UniProtKB/Swiss-Prot annotation, chain B:
Stated name of the protein: Large ribosomal subunit protein eL32
GO terms under cellular component: cytoplasm; cytosol; cytosolic large ribosomal subunit
Primary site of residence: cytoplasm
The family this protein is said to belong to: Belongs to the eukaryotic ribosomal protein eL32 family.
Subcellular location, record wording: Cytoplasm
Lineage: Eukaryota, Fungi, Dikarya, Ascomycota, Saccharomycotina
One biological process term in Gene Ontology: cytoplasmic translation
Residues of the full protein shown: 52 to 129 of 130
From Swiss-Prot, chain C:
Name of the coding gene: MAK21
Entry protein name: Ribosome biogenesis protein MAK21
Family per similarity comment: Belongs to the CBF/MAK21 family.
Additional remark text: Present with 15000 molecules/cell in log phase SD medium.
Subcellular location field: Nucleus, Nucleolus
Oligomer status and interactors: Interacts with NOC2. Forms a nucleolar complex with NOC2 that binds to 90S and 66S pre-ribosomes.
Source organism, top-level taxon: Eukaryota
Function comment: Required for 60S ribosomal subunit synthesis.
Length: 514, 78, 173
RNA sequence: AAAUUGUUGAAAGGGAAGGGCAUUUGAUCAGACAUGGUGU
RNA sequence: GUUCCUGCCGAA
RNA sequence: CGUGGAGGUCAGUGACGAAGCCUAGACCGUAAGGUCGGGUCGAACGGCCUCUAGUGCAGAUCUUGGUG
């Protein structure tokens, strides 16, 4: 067995930069294989000097791709990097086929940003050989998605996703049908347990995977439509299972299967995807296939919201409600959500006076899905539930704040609200509900005075879409109110993060002295 | 009906299908007791460990080259 | 007069939204409005309030029902169409449900020949799931969607068609 | 607080709900040798 | 009345 | 094997979620059971050496409430 010496690595690098040969490449790659397999397993090479090992890693990842390219220079064709036909290419292709899973092991063992960047770059200069394989291209896109899924550093996730875009947009044929599958499967099974720490990271994962679906208008439609259907299967399995008498699997508590964060993560990611693809600018006066999936997504979400009208899962309703509001904002589709909200306004929490008041911490409505059975029937929980509910009404009826149809979108709601306000016992709730009522009437009066000067009827869609294009949405009475409220909410979340961040900083201080 | 005749062979007893005996681990110091016995033993992080400690244990285990029986537990589900 | 007053009131009853018997209420509304063709202002007021109530409902079958009724009430009372020339309909034209959108478009355009009477138990969520899981058995995948006339295809299933004509492969089984 | 009763909503089904068995058609998931070396 | 699981020694 | 009590010990574990309970999930043990995963739970508790207490069912007289 040859022993790695600082001389031998130096000579291999010496002749790498000038006149390399396939023998040298196989030797380097075999040494690399030993280097990466030292902890995890005959081998011709032995490694004893950290200097030699580090030099081997350096020269391999930074220059073996360079020599590989120089031997078999690829040519750009229709924006894609494609190898030519020839014997020498095939010999080099087997060599990259003998380097690929060492890169895979490095990918699976990423722990920091710069190592991720180096491995991803070296992998980048070896796509055109590994596109010819599917045990490697799949595991490649499966591994980097694994890194994109499990890293706790936002920079590492950014690097992984930038790699996914750069490689995917070049080729689009072998990878794109696997990138989307792997990413959304991450959102199914290998989903990150939610917490105030992981929210920006998972939000980036969703806001990122949304872009990938939008790149290919047709193929995305092929993928998401299948996966959303998978959700529907679970949705249909739990509804039937709860309703029927069969003691097969958990008739009484089947909610566990579908009332999970992973499922809500799914339905949020789909709303983000459709919103991204359906934006008016990306539409550009051109219909996109993803718009036709709006109806399935809305049906699934509405079917999930109504499956339990219990206080234990009101936070779950709120999140999907915000998602639907986003979808309607971006696409302009008319989602009915007030019937749901008013239907919850008959509950024992929105209606009956609080029983206990232990003075626990305020519930994290944004970043939780469940009440945890201690906040049930408490002053804090009622006060926070209503705090969310009022702002949700504000958002939903701020969508149409400047439309001509707002008066008649408001009338049935103000009447029902006054019915509930006049019959509701809880003082604080009546105060909050009241505020929304008068501001709704105020914006109704505003739109009426602005509409009295209109000469075109309801049929003229072109002019109807032009109504008050000069006026900003936030200048309306419901906008000017709710926008400010949004700030009064947004700042709060900031002060949470700018607080929690410090806690960890303080925590770090302790291990300094431990 | 259970009885001694059903007893498993000693050489194969207390062995997972991966071939590694499971050893409970609480902290990094207990992990380091399995430094070389990577072939014979695989670590298993205890149920009561917090998420912040589990990532450190996983990193140290990868550095040592010791197989963890239950990774992605409380960092992922199932 | 008192009956029509109570009906105009009950249109704003909040419990109506979650009532299983919305179909009986639909039929009653149609019969009442048909019987009141002479009072053009009253029937127009019911039409306006019907659309007001519909804008905030979640049951699709009921909304398609109201639109079909309004289309038919337009035939007996053509003066109802004057309201479209003399605002809510824009929202239903932009409704998430394709069937509701098509019904609204037909009511605005007046193109009534392509409307079958909507049937309750259709458009309901469980029925949509039964289609969408592709296993009804008294299936969607079994029919071959490569060759189905575009206008013949019902609005409800258009997205299905797209996927199948994109998928090829297991399009017809 | 259980246990118990009643109105409303969803689903399935048939006069009971109901199971087990067989066939049928589908949908969906996992499925390494990253085989050590040499040769042109 | 029976007496957590396994094993052992053993009349008549 | 399991349940408590006490002494000692693991510079043990813990809001980045402790104890308790469930888990027709994975691994281990012939088994009593143990470990992990998940769910539930939401503030502290566990492992280990020693001594000390201490393992699940059956059935009758009937009694009470409640329902015919
Ligand atoms: Mg546990
Ligand atoms: Mg029914
Ligand atoms: Mg003790
Ligand atoms: Mg247990
Ligand atoms: Mg066994």
């Amino acid at each position: 067995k040859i022993e790695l010496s600082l001389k031998l690595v130096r000579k291999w690098k010496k002749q790498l930069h000038d006149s390399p040969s396939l023998k040298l490449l196989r030797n380097i790659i075999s040494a690399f294989k030993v280097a990466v397999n030292l902890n995890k397993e005959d081998y011709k090479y032995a490694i004893t000097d950290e200097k030699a090992f580090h030099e081997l890693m350096f020269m391999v990842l930074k220059d073996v791709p360079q020599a590989i390219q120089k031997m078999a220079p690829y040519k750009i064709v229709k924006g894609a990097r494609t190898l030519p036909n020839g014997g020498n290419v095939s010999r080099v292709s087997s060599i990259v086929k003998s380097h690929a899973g060492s890169l895979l092991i490095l990918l699976n063992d990423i722990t920091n940003t710069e190592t991720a960047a180096l491995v991803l770059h070296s992998v980048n200069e070896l796509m055109p050989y590994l596109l010819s394989y599917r045990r490697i291209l799949k595991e490649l896109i499966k591994s980097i998605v694994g890194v994109w899924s499990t890293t706790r550093e936002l920079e590492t996730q950014i690097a992984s996703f930038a790699f996914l875009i750069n490689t995917t947009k070049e080729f689009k044929k072998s990878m794109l049908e696997t990138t989307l599958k792997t990413t959304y499967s991450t959102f199914i099974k290998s989903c990150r347990k939610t917490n105030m720490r992981s929210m920006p990271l998972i939000n980036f994962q969703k806001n990122s995977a949304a872009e990938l679906f939008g790149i290919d208008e047709v193929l995305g439609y092929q993928v998401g439509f299948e996966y959303i259907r998978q959700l529907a299967i679970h949705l249909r399995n739990t509804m039937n299972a709860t309703t029927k008498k069969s003691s097969k699997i958990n008739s009484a508590e089947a909610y566990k299967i579908v009332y999970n964060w992973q499922f809500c993560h799914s339905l949020d990611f789909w709303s983000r995807v459709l919103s991204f693809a359906c934006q008016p600018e990306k539409e550009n006066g051109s219909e996109s296939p993803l718009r036709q999936l709006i109806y399935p997504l809305v049906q699934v979400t509405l079917g999930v919201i109504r499956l339990i009208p219990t206080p234990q899962f009101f936070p779950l309703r709120f999140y999907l409600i915000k998602s639907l509001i986003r979808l309607s904002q971006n696409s302009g589709v008319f989602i009915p959500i007030y019937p749901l909200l008013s239907e919850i306004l008959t509950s024992t929490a929105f209606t009956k006076a609080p029983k206990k008041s232990p003075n626990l911490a305020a519930f994290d409505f944004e970043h939780n899905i469940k009440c945890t059975q201690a906040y049930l029937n408490t002053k804090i929980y009622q006060e926070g539930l209503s705090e969310q509910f009022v702002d949700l009404l504000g958002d939903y009826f701020a969508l149409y704040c400047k439309n001509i149809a707002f008066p008649e979108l408001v009338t049935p709601v103000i009447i029902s609200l006054r019915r509930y306000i006049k019959t509701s016992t809880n003082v604080k709730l009546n105060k909050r509900l009241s505020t929304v009522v008068e501001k709704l009437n105020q914006n109704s009066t505003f739109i009426q005075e602005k509409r009295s000067d209109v000469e075109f009827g309801p049929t003229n869609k072109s002019e109807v879409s032009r109504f008050l294009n000069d006026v900003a949405w936030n200048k309306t009475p419901l906008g000017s109110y709710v926008a400010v409220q949004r700030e009064v909410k947004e700042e709060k979340a900031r002060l949470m993060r700018e607080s929690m961040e410090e806690q960890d900083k303080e925590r770090e201080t302790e291990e300094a002295k431990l | 009906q259970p009885k001694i005749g059903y007893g498993s062979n000693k050489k194969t007893k207390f062995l997972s299908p991966s071939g590694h005996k499971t050893f409970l681990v609480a902290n990094v110091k207990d992990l380091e007791t399995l430094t070389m016995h990577t072939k014979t033993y695989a670590a298993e992080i205890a149920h009561n460990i917090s998420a912040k400690n589990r990532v450190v244990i996983l990193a140290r285990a990868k550095a040592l080259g010791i197989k963890v029986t239950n990774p992605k537990g409380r960092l992922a589900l199932e | 007069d008192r009956y029509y007053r109570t009906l105009y009131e009950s249109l704003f009853d909040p419990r109506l939204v979650n009532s299983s018997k919305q179909g009986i209420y639909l039929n009653l509304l149609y019969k009442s409005l048909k019987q009141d063709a002479l009072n053009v202002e009253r029937v127009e007021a019911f039409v306006k309030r019907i659309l007001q109530v519909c804008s905030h409902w979640l049951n699709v079958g009921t909304i398609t029902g109201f639109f079909f009724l309004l289309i038919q009430l337009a035939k007996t009372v053509p003066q109802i169409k004057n309201l479209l020339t003399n605002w809510e309909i824009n929202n239903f034209i932009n409704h998430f449900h394709p069937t509701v959108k098509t019904y609204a478009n037909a009511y605005v355009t007046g193109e009534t020949e392509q409307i079958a009477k909507p049937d309750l138990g259709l458009f309901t969520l469980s029925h949509f799931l039964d289609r969408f899981v592709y296993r009804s058995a008294k299936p969607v995948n079994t029919e071959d969607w490569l060759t189905k006339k575009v206008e013949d295809i019902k609005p409800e299933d258009k997205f299905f068609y797209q996927y199948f004509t994109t998928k090829k492969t297991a399009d017809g089984k």
